[PDB]
UniProtKB/Swiss-Prot annotation, chains A, B:
GO MF annotation, one: UDP-2,3-diacylglucosamine hydrolase activity
Example GO biological process: lipid A biosynthetic process
Organism this protein belongs to: Klebsiella pneumoniae subsp. pneumoniae (strain ATCC 700721 / MGH 78578)
Stated role: Hydrolyzes the pyrophosphate bond of UDP-2,3-diacylglucosamine to yield 2,3-diacylglucosamine 1-phosphate (lipid X) and UMP by catalyzing the attack of water at the alpha-P atom. Involved in the biosynthesis of lipid A, a phosphorylated glycolipid that anchors the lipopolysaccharide to the outer membrane of the cell.
Entry binding sites for Mn(2+) 1: 7, 9, 40, 183
Residue positions binding Mn(2+) 2: 40, 78, 113, 181
Record family assignment: Belongs to the LpxH family.
Protein keywords: Cell inner membrane, Cell membrane, Hydrolase, Lipid A biosynthesis, Lipid biosynthesis, Lipid metabolism, Manganese, Membrane, Metal-binding
CDD domains: MPP_YbbF-LpxH
UniProt keyword Membrane present: yes
Cofactor note: Binds 2 Mn(2+) ions per subunit in a binuclear metal center.
Annotated protein name in UniProt: UDP-2,3-diacylglucosamine hydrolase
Location within or outside the cell: Cell inner membrane
Length: 228, 228
């Protein structure tokens, strides 16, 4: 099976979610063919030089999975778009583009975080266009750590636009889309490419985790409580 | 694994949902230890003497499962409370009470349809108390079929009360509850019996089916599209 997760929003203040993630990594993930993390792995990210110990605990847990023969992949979310090549290296994770078209046992599937589908929030889209500008990023990342922390400190979810969904599945000519961002776990049926299509939406990790499990014959969205 | 499903609302007008159910019965269900159907298997029921061919197609598909060594069980919903011992016999299904406390590989779990938890709808609860009165049922069931059909024809969802949930899990001293009715698939965490508790809610069958799969170590809520 190939596994997809998203919207863990991992942080120092929620160790319970972190332990549920580490349980997942040490059991479920080890049996998989591949693990894809579709963004918002972290609640925030101000650069790979942050010495936050949570960041290394996570990179090490993912790296163990990678080193067991299970490739892990990462698509950025809106929370963690600054995750960079040094984190990739520490984690063993391969950074992917904002949209990837995969081939899972013969089935073609589009993966993305899902924030780009939220076209009714121009407030957000304006923000995203800015923070995706490389010179703006590199500016931020050139600041001393202590100034970046204070900038984030200061800065303290629209559903998808149905048409944006259809447009994305039609650009890639796919009948399957997996995404997160919206925190509304569900399987949807629509039409794309003159045919039945499915959009599978992952949940955020709070009381429960969620994953999409793709096998040769089946696609399942699975929720699991943190009970052990 | 032990499987739980609910809220299929099967009917003549939705053959697609019926085929998705029959797929499920012929694959997934055959590998299970037991299958529990927690109510609203049918969109309506006016008695086991209804000759609706859908009713026999379903009973035969369930009976095949039962005859393969997989016991099936049924708790009534609000839609199909008149399902009776003749349908049980045709289907091989065992009729259970409105609340059952099960033992699944050592774990104690409460199952119910879930309409009884909806105590903020007195409109419904009044209705339910009436249609659960045996003399009222037997009256209805004594009518000629054609009159019952016309009575149903004339008759053309509140979420749970959180306290009613806690009260139910505390009456049975359980940390696990599985139910349907509300059509809001989710895993919830609460407190019961001074401890962590989980309520797992099944979805209705529309574009997707849903099931709770209980194994010795895990409880998962699974959604699956009808894609094959
Ligand atoms: C949907 N999100 C937004 C909606 C409208 C506008 C902005 C956002 C948004 O993602 N904001 C946001 C705020 C802070 C972060 S951060 O990781 O702390 N960091 C990014 C690098 C610059 C400093 C801030 C990352 C993202 S939300 C509600 O989750 O924050
Ligand atoms: C939650 N349900 C109710 C809410 C308020 C009041 C009543 C109901 C309700 O379940 N009504 C209802 C109506 C008809 C049926 S029936 O199967 O067709 N049949 C039952 C036997 C008597 C004749 C009608 C079964 C149930 S709902 C909205 O699903 O119908
Ligand atoms: Mn998120
Ligand atoms: Mn997001
Ligand atoms: Mn129902
Ligand atoms: Mn119901």
């Amino acid at each position: 099976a190939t596994l997809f997760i998203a919207d863990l929003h991992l942080q120092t203040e929620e160790p319970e979610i972190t332990a549920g993630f580490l349980r997942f990594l040490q059991g479920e993930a080890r049996q998989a063919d591949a693990l894809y993390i579709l963004g918002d792995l972290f609640e925030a990210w101000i650069g790979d030089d942050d010495p936050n110990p949570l960041h290394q605990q996570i990179a090490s847990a993912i790296k163990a999975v990678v080193d067991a023969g299970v490739p892990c992949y990462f698509i950025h979310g809106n929370r963690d778009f600054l995750v960079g090549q040094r984190f990739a290296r520490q984690s063993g994770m391969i950074l992917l583009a904002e949209e990837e078209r995969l081939d899972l046992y013969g089935r073609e599937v589009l993966i993305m975080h899902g924030d780009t589908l939220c076209t009714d929030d121009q407030g957000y889209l304006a923000f995203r266009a800015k923070v995706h500008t490389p010179w703006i990023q590199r500016l931020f990342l050139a600041l001393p750590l202590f100034i970046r922390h204070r900038i984030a400190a200061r800065m303290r979810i629209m559903d998808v636009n149905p048409q944006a969904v259809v447009d994305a599945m039609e650009r890639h000519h796919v009948q399957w889309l997996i995404h997160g961002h919206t925190h509304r776990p569900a399987v949807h049926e629509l039409q794309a490419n003159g045919q039945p299509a499915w959009r599978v939406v992952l949940g955020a990790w709070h009381s429960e985790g969620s994953m999409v499990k793709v096998t040769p014959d089946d696609v399942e969205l699975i929720h699991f409580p943190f009970h052990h």
